[PDB]
């Protein structure tokens, strides 16, 4: 499971999920990528669930690129406590993902293997996704 | 200016040979001798003794110039030393005093070193300077065994106008620096 090794600040404010993706919008490392279609907080558990599913489906071969990282701390108050008395404790980490962001790539596999592995990985994620392949537009960037 | 033989020899036998070997078109291109800096990193006079006075007197006799005190720039526990305490001496020799000291070094100091086999040819700075390190102080002519109380060494910095080691090497061997093969 991913998380930053060091942090300047333990807790962050809940920001905003506005706008299309800032960076990471084109396939850059692999041959087939999974692209987000709507914004969400993607937790570290969901990232690992998707990665392991591709590893199992890629028996022997395959190399997987994870292009998102959960750097944002996620906070929760303990059960049965009232409002107030400070911000809740850190319970996990999420990655802020906006539409157009390429989340995963794969390489070293056939086309059939890539489409099935990325399809299963998407079922582990809380958002609608699409599968893309590297094209001239990605190389033009 | 005092008629030192070493300065006389540099202008008579060394300069004409140097231009022959390297083909300088300017009389100021040929390497000159800039200064000699003698440093004594005592380190034992931090707080256990004010024995800087004994070394200052000995250094002044060897070079004719009273040396200056150098102080610690910071505190280090592993050396048990505090910032600002005196841990060395340094003297700078230029012009006639520079020539006089090197003549004694090449003639009456270096031959008195135990098991002398020549100077290190790989100690050239890489930009035309030389540095050598001494372990003994009684090899100098003005030092006798009677007034020697503790053994002390020094570092000698020889600074030249030469740009490269090969040109600084040529000046030093002709001047009289003997080097190991």
């Amino acid at each position: 499971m991913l998380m930053p090794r060091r942090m300047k600040y333990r807790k962050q404010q809940r920001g905003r999920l506005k706008g299309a993706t800032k960076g990471g919008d084109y396939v850059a490392f692999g041959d087939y990528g999974l692209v987000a279609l709507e914004p969400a907080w993607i937790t570290a558990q969901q990232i690992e669930a998707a990665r392991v599913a591709m590893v199992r489906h890629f028996r022997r071969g395959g190399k997987i690129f994870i292009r998102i990282f959960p750097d944002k701390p996620y906070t929760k108050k303990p059960l049965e406590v009232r409002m107030g008395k400070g911000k809740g404790n850190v319970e996990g980490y999420v990655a802020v993902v906006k539409p157009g962001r390429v989340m995963f790539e794969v390489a070293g596999v056939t086309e059939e293997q890539a489409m099935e592995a990325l399809r299963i990985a998407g079922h582990k994620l809380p958002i609608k996704t699409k599968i893309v392949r590297r094209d001239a537009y990605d190389e033009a960037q | 200016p005092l008629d030192v033989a070493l300065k006389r020899k540099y202008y008579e036998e060394v300069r004409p040979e140097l231009i022959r070997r390297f083909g300088y078109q300017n009389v100021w291109e040929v390497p000159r001798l800039e200064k000699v800096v003698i440093n004594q990193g005592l380190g034992e006079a931090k707080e256990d003794a004010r024995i800087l006075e004994k070394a200052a007197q000995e250094l002044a006799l060897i070079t004719g110039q009273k040396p200056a005190v150098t102080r610690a720039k910071k505190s280090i526990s592993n050396f048990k030393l505090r910032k600002g305490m005196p841990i060395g001496l340094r003297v700078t020799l230029r012009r006639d005093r520079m020539w006089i000291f090197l003549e004694k070094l090449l003639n009456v100091a270096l031959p008195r070193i135990r098991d002398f086999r020549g100077l290190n040819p790989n100690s050239f700075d890489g930009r035309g300077n030389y540095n050598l390190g001494l372990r003994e102080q009684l090899i100098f002519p003005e030092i006798t065994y009677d007034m020697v109380d503790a053994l002390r060494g020094m570092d000698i910095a020889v600074v030249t106008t030469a740009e490269t080691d090969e040109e600084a090497r040529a000046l030093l061997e002709l001047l009289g620096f003997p080097f190991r093969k």
């Binding site: 107030g84 008395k85 400070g86 911000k87 | -």
Partner: protein, 77 residues
């Protein structure tokens, strides 16, 4: 938490007090700042807390000199 945090200090109301083209009297405070964000130009003095004040009556003028800094001048009438 609600025990570790909870402190702040009063706001200081810093910034430029008179802008370019305004008419000022001698002694008028022109800039409140921490350090020399703006530098004292012609007919401008600096107090011990980097406050810029006018030395004569006149018109405020601002100037940017690149690497030399930003200056505030007072041009007399």
């Amino acid at each position: 938490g609600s025990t570790r945090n909870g402190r702040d200090s009063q706001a200081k109301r810093l910034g430029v007090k008179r802008y370019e083209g305004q008419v000022v009297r001698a002694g008028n405070i022109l800039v409140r700042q921490r350090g020399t964000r703006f530098k004292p130009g012609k007919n401008v003095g600096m107090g011990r807390d980097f406050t810029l004040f006018a030395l004569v009556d006149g018109v405020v003028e601002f100037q940017d000199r690149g690497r030399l800094g930003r200056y505030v001048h007072v041009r007399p009438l």
